[PDB]
Amino acid sequence: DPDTAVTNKQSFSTDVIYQVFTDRFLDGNPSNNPTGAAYDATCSNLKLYCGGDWQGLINKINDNYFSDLGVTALWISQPVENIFATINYSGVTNTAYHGYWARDFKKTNPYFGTMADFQNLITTAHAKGIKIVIDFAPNHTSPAMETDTSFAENGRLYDNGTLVGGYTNDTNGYFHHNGGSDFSSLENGIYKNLYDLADFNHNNATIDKYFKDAIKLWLDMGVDGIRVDAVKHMPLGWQKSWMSSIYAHKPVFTFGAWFLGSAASDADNTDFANKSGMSLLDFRFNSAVRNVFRDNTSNMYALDSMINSTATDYNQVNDQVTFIDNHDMDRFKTSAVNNRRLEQALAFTLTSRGVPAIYYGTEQYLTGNGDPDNRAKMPSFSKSTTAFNVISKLAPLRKSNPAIAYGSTQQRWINNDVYVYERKFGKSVAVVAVNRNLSTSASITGLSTSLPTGSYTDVLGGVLNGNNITSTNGSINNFTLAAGATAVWQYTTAETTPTIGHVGPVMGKPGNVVTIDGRGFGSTKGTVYFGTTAVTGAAITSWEDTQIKVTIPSVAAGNYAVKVAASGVNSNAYNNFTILTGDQVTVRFVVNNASTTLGQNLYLTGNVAELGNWSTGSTAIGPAFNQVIHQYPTWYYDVSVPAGKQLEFKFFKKNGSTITWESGSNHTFTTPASGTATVTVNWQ
């Protein structure tokens, strides 16, 4: 199928996601509504259930609300069964309407629908070309108190009805009993409770297996993507292992939520996006956009700076999910924020790199500050707002123009209030001009672009006061950009030479099937390169002009570049593809008596690519932890490592550029065939 079809579960670059709180959208079936105190028919007390369900989503898909809006994917609340109990937090009654208080990841939330309703949602969605993305929260169950089992449901977990265990009397150690996190460090936030939510101990073999089994269930039902909640509060190692099991079974686009407060680069965040096997919600992009269009605390330069900085930090910037707001912050729209600014932020987001997501109601200019006010009921289904118009005209461009879906970004003109950028991919180009100044127009002179000679019409049709331009070999004739204007000019044409636009997933073991999207691959089965290794014939399960499904060859584990050769012509190289040694398992490495010097950290490396292949650089594992599970001078770290393999490893201390290794022989350990394990050694 073409890279743009609904069947492409590995790439969302050509899509526009619509994030919706299932309970706050449409109550299509009042028969499944909760009873009593947990329900509010008027939906005025936003902490209670309002009745929204999967039937309501089905209805709006059938009457073409989403089709006319232009969205091609739906991101819904966690579908799993949540606790039924009601919780009173200092006077106010709270319910699990948000879906984050799971109790059984193998059953559906009765209030949203049955297992059958869910299947019906998938079918109905796919029939109209809409992908379904689900929220999944494997970090915890629900609120719990160890001393009081009568609080909520004591964070109890069920395996399709069968009780696995609760927070109190957790003899098996399914959860962490290290208190609540104070967010003082990364380690503190991973092994301690997120508020009062019972934290899972993924090192426990049962919990590890439970989540691999539980996710397969939903993948088997046809979900096209996964939004992993609180990725910053679970070990990267376990998550990478979990991700490889997903990719070996049914690869789907997966991204996580790692909260960031500014557009500033964050080392840990960058590492996660580059090493976990999944991408992230682009909080840096979000901050810049809000600072510039909403809050007026930054100018266009901050926007351009962020575009360049993020493109440099993330290996695959096109996999990051962008947005102007969501359930974790104030609604973009405020009384002090103009409609045009909201509209410009949307246009910018929809034409920029990454995978754009729209929080439900944005098209209706919904207001609401903080939790829960920002999760109000959908006020209307009108298709007449300007914002609705902008989305319907720009969203389709991600499918029709590869420059917008896979292209690079270059600044063509800029000043405090004006920004003109260019998206380019092969011969296809897209140019967007934005003037955030609401009162004064701007005279643009000396603008150059890659647009071929010709006359260009504003894709928006002037709804955002856009204008038409004339290109003379890229040189655009002088023009006036109206106050608060924003225009989109583009040019698309067929590509003759092979060009890779996206590869998904970007991690896997030999035998897994990866998807290569792009242009000009031709219909004749060619050859795929993973470094220097050529992959041909049967190994290439599918080959079309815009997409190539290929099997990962049995080469040495490591970092590889991917190229495609069609009719003797070599395409561009898609860098940083990770090939694993084989199936993964999470192992906790513990080392005793590793006393260090001020500012000196402990790292780990060994004889497999997953351990860095004896490297002491960015591929080495670390820095190790030393506060929560084990205390200094004992260090520890959870690492995704190959299953059933004899490993050789050593720890090393690194302060500045001085590296001091362990003496003696290398430590050895044979990893288990599956699950988890703990290996403890003494510093030599």
Ligand X SMILES: OC[C@H]1O[C@H](S[C@H]2[C@H](O)[C@@H](O)[C@@H](O[C@H]3[C@H](O)[C@@H](O)[C@@H](S[C@H]4[C@H](O)[C@@H](O)[C@@H](O[C@H]5[C@H](O)[C@@H](O)[C@@H](S[C@H]6[C@H](O)[C@@H](O)[C@@H](O)O[C@@H]6CO)O[C@@H]5CO)O[C@@H]4CO)O[C@@H]3CO)O[C@@H]2CO)[C@H](O)[C@@H](O)[C@@H]1O
Picked from ligand X, Ca ion, none, the partner binding residue 610 (CB below 5 to 8 A depending on kind) is none
Using CB atoms within 10 A of its CB, is residue 532 exposed (0-12), middle (13-18) or buried (19+)? Answer: exposed
Work out how close the CB of 564 gets to ligand X at its nearest, in angstroms, rounded to a whole number.
39
- C-beta separation of 566 from 554 below 8 A: no
Structure tokens at 490: 């583009």
Within 10 Å of residue 65's Cβ, how many Cβ atoms?
20
Q: Which residues between 259 and 278 bind ligand X (CB under 6 A)?
A: 259
* Span near ligand X by CB under 6 A; candidates 70-78, 190-198, 201-209, 577-585: 190-198
x-or-dash string of contact with ligand X, 391-430, rule CB under 6 A: ----------------------------------------
Picked from ligand X, Ca ion, none, the partner binding residue 259 (CB below 5 to 8 A depending on kind) is ligand X
x-or-dash string of contact with ligand X, 200-229, rule CB under 6 A: ------------------------------
φ, ψ of residue 491 in degrees (nearest 5)? -155, 120
Work out how close the CB of 247 gets to ligand X at its nearest, in angstroms, rounded to a whole number.
25
- C-beta separation of 41 from 51 below 8 A: yes
Helix (H, G, I), strand (E, B) or coil at 621: strand
SS3 string, 67-87, reads HHHCCCEEEECCCEEECCCCE
Structure tokens at 439: 């009162």
Q: Which residues pair with 413 in a beta bridge?
A: 420
| Binding interface with Ca ion (CB under 5 A) | 27, 29, 32-33, 51, 53, 139, 199, 233
- C-beta separation of 386 from 339 below 8 A: yes
Work out how close the CB of 80 gets to Ca ion at its nearest, in angstroms, rounded to a whole number.
17
Q: Which of 213, 266, 371, 648 touches ligand X by CB under 6 A?
A: 371
φ, ψ of residue 57 in degrees (nearest 5)? -70, -40
Question: Does residue 304 interact with ligand X by CB under 6 A?
Answer: no
Q: Residue 29: which of 59, 63, 66, 74 has the closest Cα?
A: 59
Nearer to ligand X by Cβ, of 43 and 535: the residue is 43
Q: Calculate the CA dihedral of residues 374, 379, 382, 388 and round it to 10 degrees.
A: 0
Question: Does residue 514 interact with ligand X by CB under 6 A?
Answer: no
Picked from ligand X, Ca ion, none, the partner binding residue 89 (CB below 5 to 8 A depending on kind) is ligand X
Nearer to ligand X by Cβ, of 151 and 589: the residue is 151
x-or-dash string of contact with ligand X, 318-347, rule CB under 6 A: ----------x-------------------
Question: Does residue 232 interact with ligand X by CB under 6 A?
Answer: yes
Work out how close the CB of 42 gets to Ca ion at its nearest, in angstroms, rounded to a whole number.
14
Picked from ligand X, Ca ion, none, the partner binding residue 287 (CB below 5 to 8 A depending on kind) is none
Binding residues for ligand X, total number by CB under 6 A: 16
Q: Which residues between 126 and 155 bind ligand X (CB under 6 A)?
A: 143
Q: Cis ω on the peptide bond leading into residue 110 (within 30° of 0)?
A: no
Q: Cis ω on the peptide bond leading into residue 633 (within 30° of 0)?
A: yes
Picked from ligand X, Ca ion, none, the partner binding residue 33 (CB below 5 to 8 A depending on kind) is Ca ion
Work out how close the CB of 381 gets to ligand X at its nearest, in angstroms, rounded to a whole number.
25
Q: Using alpha carbons, list the distances in angstroms from residue 123 to 18, 20, 186, 217, 276.
A: 18, 18, 41, 16, 31
Work out how close the CB of 117 gets to Ca ion at its nearest, in angstroms, rounded to a whole number.
10
**Chain residues in the site for ligand X (CB under 6 A):** 89, 94, 98, 100, 143, 183, 194-197, 230, 232, 257, 259, 328, 371
